[PDB]
Design a protein around this ligand. Structure first.
Ligand SMILES: CC1=C(/C=C/C(C)=C/C=C/C(C)=C/CO)C(C)(C)CCC1
Length: 175
């Protein structure tokens, strides 16, 4: 039934970088393998004059040594032939934080209430994702509307990630 091949996933039509800019609170996430931001996650997206999108993001993360630090992360997005699909090069302002290059797809957003992001880091041989992560972001760090939760749930099902997300606390700790 369900097509779970990554190449089949619908993304936001006519994605608008400039409209996406601003503050996005992470309200729920699906984690990938390995280290990952844990909670108190807020991203700030920017687009410069020449249309280049970037973002900073802050969140608590536990390092291999169980320290729970506030990470200040930086990403720069490279446009692709699909306006909703980017390559995100990222790093932290501390040198010990993870650095990498991930797909960054805007699965859906209405720009002023919610967004659903996705990254597949590794494809299975069948074209499904072997190692994904996904954030549900909000403009307002309260809960969402029933009507916006239902839409978010539909987008999670499109990604074959239904029931795989956890809610994210916001309770001080970071910057
Ligand atoms: C940069 C950035 C993002 C991803 C951050 C990641 C993937 C951080 C991982 C941090 C680690 C593992 C720290 C421990 O060393 C998201 C998608 C939120 C969008 C905003 C910009």
């Amino acid at each position: 039934e369900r097509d779970c091949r990554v190449s089949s996933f619908r993304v936001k039509e006519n994605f608008d970088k400039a409209r996406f800019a601003g503050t996005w609170y992470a309200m729920a996430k699906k984690d990938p393998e390995g280290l990952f931001l844990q909670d108190n996650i807020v991203a700030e997206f920017s687009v410069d004059e020449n249309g280049h999108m970037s973002a900073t993001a802050k969140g608590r993360v536990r390092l291999l040594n169980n320290w729970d630090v506030c990470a200040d992360m930086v990403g720069t997005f490279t446009d692709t032939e699909d306006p909703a699909k980017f390559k995100m090069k990222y790093w932290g302002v501390a040198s010990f934080l993870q650095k990498g290059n991930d797909d960054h797809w805007i699965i859906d957003t209405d720009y002023e209430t919610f967004a659903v992001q996705y990254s597949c880091r590794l494809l299975n041989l069948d074209g499904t994702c072997a190692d994904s992560y996904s954030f549900v972001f909000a403009r307002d760090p309260s809960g969402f509307s029933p009507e916006v939760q239902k839409i978010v749930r539909q987008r999670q099902e499109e990604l074959c990630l239904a029931r795989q997300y956890r809610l994210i606390p916001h309770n001080g700790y970071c910057d």
